[PDB]
Design a protein around this ligand. Structure first.
Ligand code: HEM
Ligand code: HEM
Ligand SMILES: C[C@H](O)[C@H](O)[C@H]1CNC2=NC(N)=NC(=O)C2=N1
Ligand SMILES: C[C@H](O)[C@H](O)[C@H]1CNC2=NC(N)=NC(=O)C2=N1
Ligand SMILES: N=C(NO)NCCC[C@H](N)C(=O)O
Ligand SMILES: N=C(NO)NCCC[C@H](N)C(=O)O
Lengths: 361, 361
């Protein structure tokens, strides 16, 4: 009753806006009647290959927390709404990793799976990111942020080698199944980058490494009332995400003290700013390492500069700019970027990507 | 009519809360009747030396943008509500600088001047901070943030030597006067710190320096409906305010490129993170310099650690904590502090310090 009312309302708003941007104003009338009859006949409607493709781009454009939005219209949209089996999903996910990686020259992509029908999911992806390291406890091993999912995977028959960098397997559930299935990732498909420093040879003693491509797989893509709970996407890393957060946070890998040791500085006094110096050297190491192995990565200054250009384009296009200052500012030298010196409207505009409840935990 | 209604309401709320904290609950009844008759007789009321003293502390405690709130109850309250002449104000301001500086061992203080009566100010301070450098244009000279006030001072007969560090004179207006008066600051009263690096000798070639004590003099102190438009206060500097903002912002002294030059690094590539390395070395220089000259200063890690202790105390006292995340996080290595990893309620609670319109511009 009310669900068939919200759907139609969001559909009218989307088709008008989407079609307007595609230089498509006259086809709006004939497309909305087809949609009205489809919602009455079945209870939902199916997007065309052009609608969801541009819808996915519009969603990226509206992502307040993303600094890489300048590249919104270049998104590689892979249509996999035809998957029916677990093998279809597994291969589609494998394909995503492969085509997105592109031997290092990362391609911003998104794979669209079947959306929810009567509020129930067709495909449910458990992984936060397709490629991600496991986490364990006694004393900290691996990535702490992955603990709950690791435990869930282990309750399904999977077992990790308990190193600091164990690749979590792909884990997802199909409609009709009570428990999810899992598949170990083929190593030939995952690029990993060992972290080394351009001037400091001892840096390799830390034996740090990270994976080349971040593929968020647990967010819901909302386009015109249609909920794509399963639609993995990826960009390339901004150095700061790895060297200032993933490897730096006390609740993550917490490596600043060990970094200070190999670069030769004391951790005795905050006034020496050892954490700041450690952060700079660790972050320099990350950018140098990815570049050296031929894997795309961007530094926060270049990223902010690209984002400034995005702000200008949005103003030129006539569109209102939305953003979350607290996430847009880089965790290192934020005042050195223009983002810090201005304010953003944190309003939510659809289409967009949303958080959804974790099936585990 | 309505003004005599807002005043009484804010007075009841303040006396109850203030007296409650002072272990003063029974004197509330007899204090509020005196205040009610005072508002009817004159149109306002006069705080006791205990009320405004604690009121000034409570205002600091409620300052969402301040990271140094752990020290709220140690504030040195100087009562100068007895000033009538421009000389009285001048000497009180001179006294503030002297006693607050305390030969380097900075004392957090605030001088209270007569508040507003029927909405009109008794004393109006034009300076943003009592001690501050001038700014000029053709090509940038001095501090750009001081340009408008410098121009106003120059329209009153004052002339600066046009160096990058010219001390602005004290400039304030008395009730009954159309234009403000000004007084050059006695150099013997102002401590300045030349910036040098502990390991890099060439750093002195930049010839940078900053003043020892930040004394905000243009904010309005609101306590129980009483508006103290003139109530200069000071703490000690957090290194980041000088080396990451005052000397780093492109719109301020913009020294990062020159810093990179003396420390021996190239400014060619963002991927080398030269701005970040320059920031670390410039900030290390600031902390080392102040410490060397015996002037109080705190690094951002120690400051955040002290602020964490403040959060705990507020929870122990039963008080709701308020804060502005965007200002609490340091401009350098914010993710290395606990502040970055949590959220704050940016609600305004009185008493507090507020912004007021600038008489110049
Ligand atoms: C092209 C390269 C890209 C860069 C450099 C980039 C960068 C960023 C960064 C730095 C963040 C903050 C991440 C964090 O702090 O955890 C972020 C968040 C986000 N980005 Fe991107 N991004 C890129 C591509 C994409 C694409 C392809 C999409 C969608 C189609 C997208 C959607 C989002 C969303 C929704 C968020 C919020 C994620 C969350 O809340 O965890 N981004 N991005
Ligand atoms: C004890 C040492 C103190 C430290 C370390 C400290 C530190 C800070 C810092 C770092 C800021 C941000 C400044 C900026 O970004 O421009 C700030 C803001 C502020 N502080 Fe303090 N503070 C201290 C004392 C005080 C005192 C004594 C008061 C009041 C009685 C106070 C009131 C405030 C207020 C109202 C703000 C906001 C100022 C504005 O909006 O420009 N602080 N403080
Ligand atoms: C509460 C606050 O919004 C969070 O701690 C933020 C702040 N900024 C952030 N920035 C980025 N890049 N990633 C985050 O997870 C993040 N989290
Ligand atoms: C719009 C935004 O609130 C301002 O640019 C902020 C952010 N954080 C800040 N932090 C500090 N310490 N001082 C500032 O002036 C400041 N300004
Ligand atoms: N830069 C991107 N996408 O392109 N980031 C997505 C989130 C990545 C996450 N912050 C991580 O470190 O794994
Ligand atoms: N730390 C304090 N007070 O104690 N700061 C007040 C504002 C100072 C200002 N940010 C400056 O650099 O001049």
């Amino acid at each position: 009753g009310s669900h068939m009312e919200i759907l139609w309302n969001e559909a009218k708003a989307f088709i008008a806006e989407c079609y307007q941007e595609l230089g498509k104003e006259e086809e709006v009338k004939d497309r909305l009647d087809s949609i009205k009859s489809e919602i009455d006949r079945t209870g939902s409607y199916v997007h065309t290959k052009e609608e969801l493709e541009h819808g996915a781009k519009m969603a990226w454009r509206n992502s307040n927390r993303c600094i890489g939005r300048l590249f919104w219209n270049s998104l590689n949209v892979i249509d996999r709404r035809d998957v029916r089996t677990k093998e279809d999903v597994r291969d589609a996910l494998f394909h995503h990793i492969e085509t997105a990686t592109n031997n290092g020259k990362i391609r911003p992509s998104i794979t669209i799976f079947p959306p929810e029908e009567k509020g129930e999911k067709q495909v449910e992806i458990w992984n936060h990111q397709l490629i991600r390291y496991a986490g364990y406890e006694g004393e900290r091993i691996g990535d702490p942020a992955s603990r709950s999912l690791t435990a869930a995977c282990e309750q399904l028959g999977w077992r990790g080698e308990r190193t600091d960098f164990d690749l979590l397997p792909l884990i997802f559930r199909m409609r009709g199944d009570e428990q999810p299935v899992w598949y170990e990732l083929p190593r030939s498909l995952v690029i990993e980058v060992p972290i080394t420093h351009p001037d400091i040879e001892a840096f390799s003693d830390l034996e740090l490494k990270w994976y080349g491509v971040p593929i968020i797989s647990d967010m819901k893509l909302e386009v015109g009332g249609i909920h794509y709970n399963a639609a993995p996407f990826n960009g390339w890393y901004m150095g700061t995400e790895i060297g200032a957060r993933n490897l730096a946070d006390e609740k993550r890998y917490d490596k600043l003290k060990k970094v200070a040791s190999v670069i030769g500085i004391s951790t005795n006094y905050n006034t020496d700013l050892w954490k700041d110096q450690a952060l700079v050297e660790l972050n320099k190491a990350v950018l140098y390492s990815y570049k050296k192995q031929g894997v795309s990565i961007v530094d926060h200054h270049t990223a902010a500069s690209q984002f400034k250009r995005f702000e200008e384009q949005e103003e030129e296009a006539g569109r209102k700019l939305t953003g979350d200052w607290t996430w847009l500012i880089p965790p290192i030298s934020p005042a050195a970027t223009h983002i810090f010196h201005r304010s953003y409207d944190n309003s939510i505009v659809k289409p967009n990507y949303f958080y959804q409840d974790k099936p585990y935990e």
